Every structure is written in C-alpha cells, then in structure tokens.
Design a binder for this molecule. Structure first.
Ligand code: SF4
Ligand code: SF4
Ligand code: SF3
Ligand code: SF3
Ligand code: FES
Lengths: 629, 629
C-alpha cells in the first residue's frame, strides 16, 4: 500500500470504511499534496511575511536574500519563531482558563471543588503566599499569583522559575540573557520581532525561541498542571482501557476532545446523575457513557478511574476521523486542537453531532457552539447530554450501522512525579542507584504528536520506543505520542517482556511498565520536575545527565515549543520529521553543533527508529562516561 | 536598467550610487525574486503551519484540501490572521512602552515632562478617573488605566471603546459579537486559533481579524497616541523640511529611525546642550544635528519645529538604504521596523555607525545595542552622541565622499483633530457644510506603507492622491505613504492648485493643503476620531459617511491591521497590492461583496490610480446620494 495509514489495526480497519464510503480523510489527502510539494517551504527558505514577497532563497538564480535583505538563516528561524508564538499562545490560553476556573471554583460557581488541598497549601508556601484564612482564600491568592506570572513584563523577576528550575540551569540562563518575561509579554515580543524589518538575526531569533520555551514551561505549564491537580487530584497509577474497541453502540456515547479537561470533568459528573441515565434509557439506549479523546482525554485518564460511566481514552488526533467512522459517537465535544476542520461531512455520514466548547474551535458544519466559561460549565455539560440523547434517538439509533474494531488495550496511566517517588519508597535515591549501576542506562522524555509526514500514524514513535526500552532506557511519555504507546501496549506490565535485561529487572522489582505515562505535551513542565529532581540530588547540571528528549512524529508547535524548552534546559533533543530549517546552513550548525557550548543541548534528527535509538544511547553513554558510571 | 526604483529623483540618484558601488539593495533584490515567484503563496493557497505540509490547494491535481482538511478559504484567512498578530503585537508593544514612559516621566525618572496637561485632564474626565492631587498623580492613574485596557480579557467590558466610538457602531459591534478583549488577550486568542486543527472556518477567522483590528485601535493606538501628545504636545500645523537634501556633510548627523519616538526626543534634548555642541565642534564638525527617518521621524515632525538642531524628515523605509549612500550619516539609531536587515555592509561602505535602541531590532553588523528603558533614555541619548562624535572623527570625516541630492521639499506637518477644528474657527461645522454643499465630495484616510510590489517606490500612492484631490476628495494621510506625499509636494500650499474646483477653493480659503499630514499608521485611531466626529455631527453611522480608506502600497501588517479596523468600522477600504487571499473565492466574496451587509465596509483592490480613484469617488457619491447631499 502506497498510502500511509497507521501502525494500529483498529485505525486501518476504520480507514477501510472511510475509503469505501468515499469520504475525504487525512490519509488520502496526503497523496495529492505529494504531487506538487514545495521544496523551498520544506527547507524553510521561503517567506510570505510582506507584500514584497513571496520570497525564496536561491543563490543559483541570484536570489541570495529576500527583497528586504534577510538571509536564509534569519528567514527560517523567524518563521519558526512566529509559528512557535501559536504554540505558546495555546498553553497561555489554557493556563489562564485554569486559573480563572480555580478562582471561580473557590467562589462556589462551578461543579468542581478543591480536591488536593495539600498541594494548594504546599505550592502557596513554596511561593511565599499568605496562607491565612480558608482554602478558598488561598486558592484565590494562588490563582491571582499565577495570573501575575502570565502577565509579568521582561523587567519584573519571576518566582515560578526560581522555585521549579534546577540550580545549575539558573546560572546558564543568566549568562545567556534568556530569563523570560511572562508568556503573554514574551509571545507578544516574539511576534513583534517577526514583523518585516525588525529582527532579522538568526542568532537573536533563536535566542528568542529559547526564551519563549522557558516562558511557556515556567510561566504557564507548571502552574496550569498543578492547578488542575488541585482541582481534580494528583494522578496515581491505575489501569485504563484504550483504543477504539472501548465503544459499545447500544449506549449513548459522548466523547470529549481537545487539551482542556474542564468540560470533560463536568460531563462525567453530569452523566453520573440518575436523571441523565434514565433519560438515556428512555431513549432506547442501555445507558449513557463518556469517553476521552486526545489530550483532554489523557488529562482525565491520568486522574480518574474507569467505571460504568467513564470508559477510557480513544487515541490521538489521527484517530478522530476513524473514530467517527465507527458509527458509535453521539456527540463529539471539542475544546481545542486537534479538532480537524473537515469533520463536518463525516459527522453527517455517520450520524454524530459536533459541539464546539471553545471560542477557539470553529470549522464548517458544527451543530452547536457552547463556548466555555467556568460559571456556565454545569449547564454546558447538561446541554451536551440533552443534545446527545436527541442525536441518538433521531440521528444514529436504527439508522447508522456501527463498525467498532475489536481492539482494546490496557495501559497504566497516571504517572506523576509524586507517583514515581511513592514507587521508589519516598526518595529518588533508588532510581539514582539503578542508573549508576547501569541497570537503567538513562531516561528519555518522549513528548510528541503524531503526523503522516514521516510514516504511517505512530510508526516511528512506537518502534523508537521499542528500540529504546530494548537498550535499557526508561521512557517518560506525554502527548499524542503517549496515547500511541498506550494503544500499542507499551504501558502495561506485559511490556516488561520487551525491555532489555537491566530495565526489565527494575520494572519487575518496582512493579511498573518500561514506559511511564506522564500525560500530555502540557506535562513537559511536569516531566522537568523529575529531571530537575535528579539534577538537584546529584548536584549535576541537567546537561550532564544521562537523559534525552524525543518528539519523533512532531506535528504542531506545542511540540516544538517543548523542544525549544528542552534545548534551553540543556538536553539532547531529537525531532522528526525535520523542522523547516534545513536550507539554512548557519542555523543548522547553531542548533545541531554549536548549542552544546551555549545551552548544553542540541537538536538531533532522523526517522529511522534504530538509528535514532542508537544515537540517543550514544549520547547517554557519553554523559555516563563523563559522570564515571 | 529595468529595475523598479522610485518616483523621487533623490532616491533614484542615490540608487545609482548603491548600484555603482555594487552593494545589495531592495531595488536590485526584487529582480531575482521575480524569476522564481510562487503563485500559490501569491494567492494565499499555500500553508506551512504543520509537519504534514507544506500544503497547496490545486483542484486540478486533486489537492482540494490540506492534509488536515482545511479548505482554501480557511487557509488564506488563517495565515492573514497570524501575520496580523504581528501587526497588533507591534502596536501593543509600543502602547505598553508609552504607558511606562508616561508613568516614569510622572515619577521624575526621564528627561521628558507633562506637556499637554489639558489633554491629560480631559482623558481622565472622559474615562472617569480620579483627578485628586497633582498632574503627575493623574498621569500615573491614566497610565495604569491604559495598561488595564491592554490586559483586559474577553469577558470584561472596555471603556476606551465606549468613550471613543460612536453610538451606532457600538450597536453594530454588539449585535455582531465583535467587541474584543484587550489587545494582549485578543492577539493571544488569534494566534491560538491559527494553530493547526483549531479554527479552520474562514468566516470565524475573518471575524477574529475584525475583532483584532478593533482591539488594536481602541485598546492600544488611541491611548498610545494621546499619551504621546501628553508627553510631547499635540501637533499643530507648521512648515517642515523633507527629502534627502536636508543633510549637510559638515555636521555630525544623527538619524533616528523606527516607530517609537522616545529616543529621538531624548536625542534632540541632549543635542541642545551647549556642552554637546562644543564636543561636536572640537571634533571638527560645524555642529551637531538630529534628523528623523520613517515613522519615528514623522511622530517628531508632527509635534516639533525645525531648528538649528532638528532638521526634518528624510523619507519612508525604501529611503533608508539610499540615505546611507549619502555618506553623510554618523549614527542611524533604530527603534523598530523598518530597520532592513542588510544595512550592515552599507554602513561599512559609507562610514555610518548603526545603533539598535530596541530589543526587537537585531540584524547582522550592528555596532551597538542600547535597549530602551524610560529611566535610561537620558544615558542612551548621551551615549549615542558620544558614539556619533567618535564615528565622525574615525570613520567619516576626511574619508567618505558625500553625495547629497539637492532635493528639499516643504510640507505642512502636524495636523491633528485639534488642528482641524482650529483651522475651521473652533468647530467642525464649516467642513460639514462645505461637504454637504458639494464643494468637497468626501474624505479619504490614506494609511499606507510603501512597497515595490505594485510599482516603483511611492508611484501608486502619489498618483492616487493626485487623482483623489482632483476629484474634490480631501485626504488625511498617515504612514510611509504620508511621507511619500510630503516629499512629492502634496502637503504644502502650492498643492492647493492640484485639487479640483471645489476642494482647491475650500483649501485656498482655509489656507490648508489638500492633503493633511496626520502622521503615522499608528494614527489610524486618531483619524477615526475625525471620522467619528463627522458621524456625530451628521447623526449617522460611520458606514453612511462619504469617506473611504486606502492603503495603496501596503507592505506589512501594521497597515493591514488598520485595514481590518477600517472594515469593522464600516468603511470602504482599498488595499494594494492584493493581500494574499485572491485564490480563496469564498473569502474574497465575504471581504469584497458580503461585508457591506454585515459591517458596512468592504475591501477594494487595484493599482491603477485613475480606476482606484474613480471607484472611491463612486462609493463616496453613493453614500452622498443616500444622505440626500
Ligand atoms: S519579509 Fe523580506 S523575505 Fe519575507 S516576503 Fe517580505 S521582502 Fe520577502
Ligand atoms: S495546517 Fe493543514 S494545510 Fe497547513 S501544513 Fe498542516 S496539514 Fe497542511
Ligand atoms: Fe498535546 S499533542 Fe500535538 S497533535 Fe494535536 S492533539 Fe496532539
Ligand atoms: Fe507605520 S508604515 Fe508600514 S512600512 Fe515600515 S516604516 Fe512604514
Ligand atoms: S508554497 Fe509558495 S514558496 Fe513554498
């Protein structure tokens, strides 16, 4: 088959239905694009930023510079920076909504509550906030402080970066001048820098990308994930069902899909009400069930158990079109990316109702717009259930043939820094000891999307993960790439049998899988808390540790902002497919060869899972040698 | 040669020097790009936003949608929105710095003062601020309030838009749901919407563009321009020297260049110190002179007189490279766009020193980096003078042959709303009356850059302006296109005789030119105050007025954000060259044909000055007919 589909049998089966039904889909749409690809854009040496364009760099024809005078290196890095403004904006958007949700929850106006009060008070103490009064007071103070971190300008020092970053990184960041403003000012400054005839210096633009990455993790991601733990609990390991076989066509099936989990949690709470289960049964369904999709789904499976109501996680963004082709979905409730913009015709064919629950998400053919507001989420969840009941009765039941694949996989979800510490007996020391002894050679943060650019859905990701664990490298996974490993079976105890001799021994002793599900790409900051704890306990810099990062099927700039963060944080950072930079030779040299002498990190490239794994292991072994282990 | 150069003889003379010196320059760089132009990018039907790309729409090869599913209309509007995030970010950056500068001025930490106290107190009254205490206290309160408007979220109502927009527009915006957040949140929301698989609906994306334009004018531009008036005075009409013959090579010559005028004002104040003039003369110069370039220069000529120190405005951004070829510049101090990124080799050849005075501005070969802070601007200005004196002694004097063109033109600069009222005898009535009677058919806001895309520098702008005034249409001008009209002689009293029968006679009686210099593209908000004043005086909506906007040689998205504002504000808005949208037929239909029934405005296109002027006049005459005049 010359069309890239998927490594997953469930997805390939449902692709067959999309193709038989003659519906457009991402897999088929790749092929016409292959007829007319632009290699200037592939290489990052085109520009569309002003009316003297569109420009291309081609020295052979005399087009050495753009009309404005920018060279290839500035051109490529500037467009990378501009796109990374989008990535940072999404994390900043989510953080602000989390903080407003916490405040409105403390004031009594949401269906949520303050669940992890211990985390609330410890965070407040770490940040030197006033902890007098009641938990609701402390929660308002924390929300206002974390909003201040979003809003702080380039000249007001941050506190999150001081609390949560490792000691030896701080001196590097000071030396390089990359301590950022709050993410709102940083992303505005980055966008302004990208306007024509402003910043045309590839080194400066790269520096601004590193700053933007730091602003995203310390100024948005860590705060938002800890606030979500305060609201919904801190994840601990538990068994979850994943893949598209979790659907049963005789129930009313509501799927929540995006990155922000607030609507999903409100849906689970509303679906547990007897009145709503009775509604479903009166409509001819066995009962009402809620399912998670993509990153919003992953946020929930990190913190919530499967039960008779909440059924598990469907898969990553390339599973959404196949999921509709099951003919089992009643409402797909969409809160952020990825909500692909041609779902309308598929929802129509398969008898599903599309509901946007964010002012960000719009595309042709959406049935309902219920933009999120914390004080409205209770009513939003109820209206979604009402829509789903009507949709089941009048659109799907008795009209649509279901075609649900048989595949269901088990994954242990809910790893957090706290869960790792508990699994090790309350101290990081046993992990240090198994690393020093060579049982685990090192650890990889797999923080990733999925894409079709460099293979069938999830091919590189799953095979790279298999190659890493065979080499006794423990994986901490987040993002659509985490969903892939869960569906592939790498996140359960059976997967110990795929690990090498040292890692399989540790996994059996600790009773954990060789791939630890840490959640979403938004959990890059949270994974950094584990690496920071390692660095601080060893009194070594992050750039000295036997670790690496990989985003091996990256798609969008949530992944690349996390990669820029990883570079600033001093790490070997593998990215595939190539970012659009390879036509800019001095930028390539900076990112791949010179950064180890600047931040400590570097970009690595390639899509062959075996070579990528070998190169990661070589870097880990080089770090090990310098540590004497 | 066949190379597009300029309509201005001074620029053509200096281009010859650049070409004979075999130095790269915008004019020559256009020709290689012409060999390899991408028609997909020209039409807005390419996309580089995720790794499944680069994508193209070409139905003839089966490429109907991008891999993700987006159609041509969503693709084109999304990239327009993303680029307009840059435009909004620059205005928001500038506003924030203006507000911090006013605050630090009130606290006594700058070389500036509160010049227009009347305006300070009038704003405080209009915005219902506390006026107790001293003017400095009120200035701090106004600065904090305007910062709040920058930071307001989508769900908190604004006050600037209530005060400074007319009643019928506010009702239209309310009905359409396009009242925006403050510009920081609005630009973050727009950027997040552009991430792959978020907002792929061209109608939604266009709506977001309109919102972004409103947020920019009411949330940043009006506040920043009125704060700059509070600091540096409200412009009134006065004679100014323009074009490149203002240079004299026997003086130490410092040129400030960008959009933010703070460093330029500080330089003028420092150069007026006798000790600094003594330093210049001891170095062998006749004395020390300051000159303005592009939009920062225009802000200064709006509010300051020509004297023995400050000498006038050089021209717009396509004049910067020619200006260096005079061999007369000692320092070029650069604060924002446009600072073209290949000036380094030109500065080296002609013996000029380049100084960046903004963290936004970086490019290869810059000699000194003096990032602006209000509390450091006195030291920055003095350091620049020190650098200039040394550069004159060591790089230029006795080494570089000057080639200064003879051309100097006179322009009347400093028109403001207040200046118009004064010229009319204290009220707007006389202008309304001569419009009603048909002497002046209507008015156009020319808010423009310059570019080479649709002609030699300033060709379309100047010829369009001549055709408009011949048709008895008064022009209020801002931006690089304003600089073009000043240099071409349309902004002095001789230009009265280029106007048609009715407008020439009104201008002769009022002793004003037919093109009124209103400053920068940043003064779109200020122009809207005049258009709003006309709406109220007539008791009609802005969409009913005999007015239009043109950006006839647009370059970057400061101009396009002003055009998006104009559309939201209900106006016929001509833009040339074509924005990168014309491959998206439904988007084109929305912008050019359906918007009149939505906001009242519409996009018009074309670069033929006669046809464009005829079309503007036809619109104005249609509006007149519906008003009964
Ligand atoms: S910014 Fe420079 S390289 Fe990009 S389109 Fe404009 S002239 Fe060309
Ligand atoms: S966002 Fe869609 S159209 Fe753009 S590059 Fe990605 S797949 Fe292609
Ligand atoms: Fe948070 S990872 Fe990047 S692709 Fe869109 S849901 Fe996936
Ligand atoms: Fe403010 S107008 Fe747009 S082009 Fe850059 S200086 Fe000119
Ligand atoms: S698609 Fe236009 S330059 Fe690549």
């Amino acid at each position: 088959m010359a069309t890239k589909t998927s490594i997953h049998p469930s997805v390939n089966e449902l692709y067959q239905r999309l193709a038989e039904d003659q519906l457009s889909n991402c897999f088929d749409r790749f092929d016409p694009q292959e007829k007319i690809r632009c290699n200037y854009c592939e290489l990052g040496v085109s520009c569309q930023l002003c009316s003297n364009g569109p420009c291309r760099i081609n020295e052979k024809v005399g087009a050495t510079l753009g009309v404005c005078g920018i060279n290839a290196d500035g051109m490529a890095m500037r467009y990378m920076l501009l796109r990374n403004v989008m990535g940072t904006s999404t994390y900043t958007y989510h953080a602000y909504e989390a903080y407003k949700t916490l405040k409105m929850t403390a004031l009594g106006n949401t269906p949520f509550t303050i669940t992890d009060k211990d985390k609330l008070y410890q965070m407040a103490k770490d940040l030197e906030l006033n902890t007098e009064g009641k938990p609701e007071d402390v929660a308002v103070r924390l929300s206002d402080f974390l909003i201040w971190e979003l809003y702080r300008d380039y000249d007001e020092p941050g506190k999150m970066i001081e609390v949560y970053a490792p000691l030896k990184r701080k001196e590097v960041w000071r030396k390089l001048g990359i301590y950022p403003a709050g993410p709102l000012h940083e992303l505005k400054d980055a966008a302004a820098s990208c306007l024509t005839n402003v910043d045309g210096d590839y080194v400066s633009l790269a520096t601004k990308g590193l700053r933007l990455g730091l602003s995203c993790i310390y100024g948005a991601q860590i705060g938002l994930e800890l606030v979500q733990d305060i609201l919904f609990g801190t994840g601990m390991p538990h068994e979850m069902d994943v893949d598209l076989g979790i659907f049963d066509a005789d129930y009313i099936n509501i799927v929540f899909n995006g990155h922000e989990p607030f609507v999903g949690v409100a849906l689970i709470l509303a679906a547990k009400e007897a009145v709503n289960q009775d509604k479903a049964k009166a409509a001819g369904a066995k009962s009402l069930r809620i399912y998670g999709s993509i990153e919003s789904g992953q946020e929930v499976v990190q913190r919530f158990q499967k039960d008779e109501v909440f059924r598990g996680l469907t898969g990553n963004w390339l599973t959404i079109e196949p999921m509709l082709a099951t003919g089992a979905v009643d409402v797909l409730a969409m809160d952020m990316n990825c909500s692909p913009p041609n779902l309308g015709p598929l929802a129509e064919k398969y008898g599903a109702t599309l509901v946007s629950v964010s002012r960000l998400v719009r595309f042709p053919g959406i049935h309902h717009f219920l933009d999120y507001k914390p004080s409205e989420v209770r009513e939003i969840a109820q209206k979604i259930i009402d829509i789903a009941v009507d949709s089941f009765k009048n659109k799907r039941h008795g009209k649509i043939t279901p075609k649900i694949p048989a595949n269901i996989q088990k994954a242990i979800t809910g790893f957090t820094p706290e869960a790792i510490l508990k699994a090790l007996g309350g101290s990081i020391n046993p992990l240090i000891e198994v690393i020093k002894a060579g049982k685990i050679k090192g650890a990889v943060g797999l923080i990733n999307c999925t894409t079709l650019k460099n293979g069938p859905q999830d091919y590189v990701t799953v095979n790279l993960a298999k190659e890493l664990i065979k080499r006794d490298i423990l994986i901490l996974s987040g993002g659509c790439g985490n969903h892939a490993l869960e569906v592939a079976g790498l996140c359960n105890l059976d997967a110990i049998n795929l690990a090498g001799p040292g890692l399989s021994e540790v996994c059996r002793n600790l009773n954990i899988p060789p791939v630890l599900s840490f959640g979403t790409c938004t959990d890059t900051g949270r994974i950094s808390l584990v690496v920071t704890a390692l660095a601080n306990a060893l009194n070594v810099d992050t750039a000295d540790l036997p670790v690496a990062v990989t985003a091996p099927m990256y798609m969008e700039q949530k992944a690349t902002i996390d990669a820029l963060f990883a570079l600033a944080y001093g790490l070997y950072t593998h990215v595939a497919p190539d970012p659009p930079v390879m036509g800019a030779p001095n930028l390539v040299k900076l990112l791949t060869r010179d950064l180890p002498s600047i931040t400590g990190g570097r970009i690595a490239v390639g899509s062959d899972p075996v070579k990528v794994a070998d190169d990661i292991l070589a870097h880990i072994n080089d770090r090990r040698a310098k540590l004497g282990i």
